[model samples]
Target: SKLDLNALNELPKVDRILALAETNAELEKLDAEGRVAWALDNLPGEYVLSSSFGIQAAVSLHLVNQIRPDIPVILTDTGYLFPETYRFIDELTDKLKLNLKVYRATESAAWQEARYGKLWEQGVEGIEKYNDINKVEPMNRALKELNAQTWFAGLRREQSGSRANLPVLAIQRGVFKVLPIIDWDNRTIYQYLQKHGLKYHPLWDEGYLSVGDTH
Candidate 1:
């Protein structure tokens, strides 16, 4: 059933969350601190952070770790990420003492090649499938296995076409998706990074505004 945001607003906080679990945008709009806090206040249970360890991910990880060190941080190892991304992940894990959980696609790179050839070499369709398999699937599996109700993400509305209207809180596949920095722009992120002296992915220096599987 589709969640009715207006109906949700009238319910008690607990009931609101119950409704929110079915609506992505409503889940995104719940709180300024994070959906985890909203979940704890209303529902109270385990949650995780699904990250790409890409540019701008450090801030999300930092905030989550500060609030709940025990929250599992899920990373999908697509086996195609830049070497520098791997190095950054390692450094952040050690520096933050993050409880990182790594996941991978159900099919290995070899299996994928045998089934569909080299996806990255192909154009748009291939790239889309590549993202679905390497990024989406693993995170879905992690959410299911951990029984996590809320997940922290580093998504910003300014990042892409589809993401332009994304709310800070959302629910997808019955899981809460939280974007604490959705409203923050690039300058804000830079300021935070500078203030904290946090290191970003090396690709940022290479003029790559968006960090993903594609170049």
Candidate 2:
């Protein structure tokens, strides 16, 4: 409610996020429930959520409904997810009444397999290129179409690398990113799920810690 537009207009997106980080200790201190409510309350402009439908994805996806019922949730489908993942996605979407906005990359799994001939085996650069084509590009496309201002992702610090710095609010490639459960480790995830009466992704029992491309 107290977001200042005129002052924010002068700063870059990441700097603006830094400013929000510095002053909004109350926002930073909030738990998942409090954080999302705070984000919707304070973060200005069109917002959407993103989910990978990974190990503990249900927790944050459920959090969306808890706070706002429905907001456009971006899913960057690579078309190579395990069959179980899709089936579970369908079941959960129906159950949650999720306002999902689906996005996909240009090439199908077959096309990539045929044309690139298994890029992962080639080298590090090759694998990065493959991910760029399959997942990263389509997500950028979705963001471009939405002109997204604030993006809520369930990424946690334990997920590692850039994620380890899981700022309650930050900016990436000029887009405002908010991670409500950034600090949450696996136990917090399970506790949230048990409290909310949620289930794990269908592939979880089969030993898929993160359900993305099966290969």
Candidate 3:
């Protein structure tokens, strides 16, 4: 035999993602374009791109579109987004021709309101019910229907402390989640969009650091 069983000593057990994070950077120390291309090419799965059409979301939209243009783009609509966000989705969807797959909550606005009071006055239980139904439930529904194996998100660690230690890639609820722009910053986001000739969510001009869900 050309191979020796003993010589095939165990190598380090590591998540390919973390190894790539430490050794292969994605738009980080190593530059993201190439790394992204490599990952999509090498990894086998039904890759789904999820976005909230929030502030500066075009960055990731363009990144993945460049590699896999026809990839499915999932949007979990809470039915209470800003008008600008809705328009932004329209604009980008037309511009990028994104294969957009929208997911929505089962209940109507008035229906939910009757069941639970308005978001602003909803204290704790109200807010939880609002988000759980409008955001969480729909997102789960979309993921299930799409049957996605590898999911791409546009989250950045610098955006919040909760995501401070997020790895480049992670497994959440059995899905291989990849955050390509995890290390990106405000300046980087601006420059990346500028270089790519992309636009931002209209809310940015209104003193918003980023977009948020409405109650």
Candidate 4:
């Protein structure tokens, strides 16, 4: 177990990093919580957990908080999230006592709207622009400002076709992206939340299978 953690920082090729993750025998054997514990023990830099605070977000929040109570939980406020999402965040923050860090685009939502004339209404191109400004930019800034070397999230293979092949560990933008619940399904997530006495985003009850920005 004499892995050189710093070598990960210097490794120039993402392919090699991913290969290393794939060959990790211990990782394959560990369960969800064990995977998270392994990341904490092995990864070499500041660790942060990101969340959308969506319908099933509580699973990740609760699991990560159980392992590391004071870890910075980053939330990118797109400024267009549903009211229920905001209320959900506040409720969980109070209950979990999360060391929450909220990040937003450098430009205000209203400013972006005035300049771009409601980008979300323009179609795919507009939606991409809106997301880059509201979601991606703030998330990238959060990782950079936090100096996070490893990011933990709650993506599951069962969530969508795009994520159906996701691995538990991977490299994203030079950071180790860890998905502790990568193998979990909706029922699994429901059971986990129930076991932890955690609640889902209020919109989940309103027939929303998935929740994100209002649009």
Comparing 2 with 3 on lDDT, the higher-scoring candidate is 2
TM-score of each: 0.79, 0.86, 0.82, 0.91
RMSD of 2: 2.7
Minimal lDDT window, size 10, model 3: 1-10
In each prediction, how many residue pairs overlap at the backbone (N, C-alpha, C within less than 3 A)? 7, 0, 2, 0
Judging by lDDT against the true structure, name the best candidate: 4
lDDT of 3 by residue, 78-151 (tens): 87888889899999999988999988889788887777668647688877877888888887777778877678
Q: Record all residue pairs in model 3 with backbone atoms less than 3 Å apart, i.e. clashing.
A: 27-31, 27-32
Write the candidate numbers in order of decreasing lDDT. 4, 2, 3, 1
lDDT of the candidates, in the order given: 0.74, 0.78, 0.75, 0.84
> Cα lDDT for residue 78, model 2?
79
TM-score, cand. 4: 0.91
Which residue pairs does candidate 1 place in steric collision?
A: 24-170, 24-171, 27-169, 27-170, 28-168, 28-169, 28-170
Model 4 scores a C-alpha lDDT of 0.84
After superposing candidate 2, which stretches have Cα over 4 Å from the reference? 1-20, 160-162
